[PDB]
Symmetry: D2
Subunit: 123 residues, 4 copies
């Protein structure tokens, strides 16, 4: 089997793109995310992400997580999922995400977390 | 003025340390979990994340990833740092726990979800 | 060990309340929910809920699911959890929920779902 | 005009039928899943839920619970029925799969999360 590697430029059906740089010996990587959609009402900007891939037993399809530090919103998104060789032999990232909104009041914390999936292929 | 830096615990008795948050909002930390979904022995594990600095909010949101050192799994946490008028701090978060599955046909069952509330330890 | 039963009036820390009726032999139940808070700009009203308790292997601490059909918004929330006898011998419902907002456009689907917990105790 | 009533399938080839939706928005249905997290043999299982009828929207939200007949688990699904200019419908949902745990101490790991997209026939 190929190893599924995170390093590279990725896209989803929507056409958001993200670029992940080299993954270091501690499993750390950095990258940038450019979303095609927003919950905000200002200009979208390219935002950094930082995360780690899990290296336990050196799996060829490893899990990973990362945090996107949005540069245009007070929110944060975290993604986690796994790098798979898909049925067609291509790498695919199968992820899920939580988008945390900023709320003014701790009484509103209950409504601040949205959840979804995101599936990425190489661009 | 709600800062992520410090030692934190939850009601379960898991603890977390977080270091200085740099001017880009990056921090690293450790997480020692009281419980695992695994049969392995727990080991303190590193975390890395960022705090959101847009508009220098006093109660910022943030995310981090815990890179478990006794499992093939990864957990992410996101939430917000609340600070009351005593200056008591609370991090209210939700997490996704991603297990490693051997086949892509099992991906659907690989992601668990929950909350974790942390106070200063 | 008591059987943990869904039937009864329940509250959470926030003071939202819920009443669940008799659970039938097919494990169905009906009730009502009054939420203390809301994410819409709308006026809050008591709303019905309908769900089932799982009765496989007649467990004393069953899982269950229910849908709240909000009467004051176009939203729906589903809750699922388990009815435990807690360490102190009280019943407790430990649940998680998904709150589905109505969006006007399919392209907004990605952001229509919030997630949370709710812990109920008998009122 | 987006109606829930019908037989539905997803990319995995799970199927679901939903019957008539009454004037209170209630419906019942069945779910035959292609996959399971369990080691039991899958059996068709009943589902019950409601469609939201406030402002009688063309693309209403709805929820339902699947009462699995081969597991101690329960799944809830919630989402929205979308209908294109052509009359082609799709149900975009997310779900929580609650496992049964023996002790309240394991509750934190009992809830899995996912999506499911259904189409007609
Ligand atoms: C599930 C969804 O996820 C994404 O691809 N998403 C993106 O690429 N961007 C949004 C991001 C929001 C950045 C926000 C900052 C803020 O608003 O605070 S986080 C997940 C979502 C998606 C949305 C779509 C879509 C296809 C997909 N998808 O392919 O997964 O088509 C129209 O909208
Ligand atoms: C919801 C729960 O969350 C946690 O605190 N959790 C932990 O501190 N540990 C587990 C972690 C699992 C490490 C695993 C690596 C692997 O297994 O693959 S991730 C979230 C959960 C929790 C449980 C409790 C509690 C308070 C909280 N809480 O505040 O988060 O009191 C009684 O039990
Ligand atoms: C986690 C949270 O959950 C609830 O209690 N929730 C409620 O009782 N109400 C909201 C409901 C919203 C109905 C919305 C219709 C619409 O807006 O579209 S859905 C579950 C959530 C909660 C919020 C709190 C709190 C304690 C808890 N809790 O104990 O879980 O203290 C002050 O705010
Ligand atoms: C995300 C996933 O979800 C499903 O379709 N699912 C199913 O139809 N079956 C599993 C169910 C198992 C219930 C369990 C009883 C028990 O084990 O306790 S609940 C949701 C999931 C899915 C998987 C796929 C797919 C498309 C989708 N989808 O559209 O959601 O194509 C390849 O595999
Ligand atoms: C993603 O990359 C493609 C090709 O580089 C480009 O045409 C598209 O606009 C990019 N998406 C965004 C949101 O920038
Ligand atoms: C958390 O720290 C406390 C006291 O400092 C300690 O007794 C407890 O063992 C720690 N929890 C874990 C899982 O290490
Ligand atoms: C919960 O019920 C108690 C009545 O016992 C009531 O005082 C409280 O306000 C109720 N909550 C709501 C939202 O009605
Ligand atoms: C779904 O329906 C199709 C035929 O209509 C059938 O071939 C398929 O096996 C069904 N799926 C399951 C899981 O029963």
């Amino acid at each position: 089997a190929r190893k599924c590697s995170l390093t590279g430029k990725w896209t989803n059906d929507l056409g958001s793109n993200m670029t992940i740089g080299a993954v270091n010996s501690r499993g750390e990587f950095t990258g940038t995310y450019i979303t095609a959609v927003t919950a905000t009402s200002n200009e979208i900007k390219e935002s950094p992400l930082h995360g780690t891939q899990n290296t336990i037993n050196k799996r060829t399809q490893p899990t990973f997580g990362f945090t996107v530090n949005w540069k245009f919103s007070e929110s944060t998104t975290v993604f986690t999922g796994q790098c798979f060789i898909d049925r067609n032999g291509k790498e695919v990232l199968k992820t899920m995400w939580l988008l945390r909104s900023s709320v003014n009041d701790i009484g509103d914390d209950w409504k601040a977390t949205r959840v979804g999936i995101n599936i990425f292929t190489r661009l």
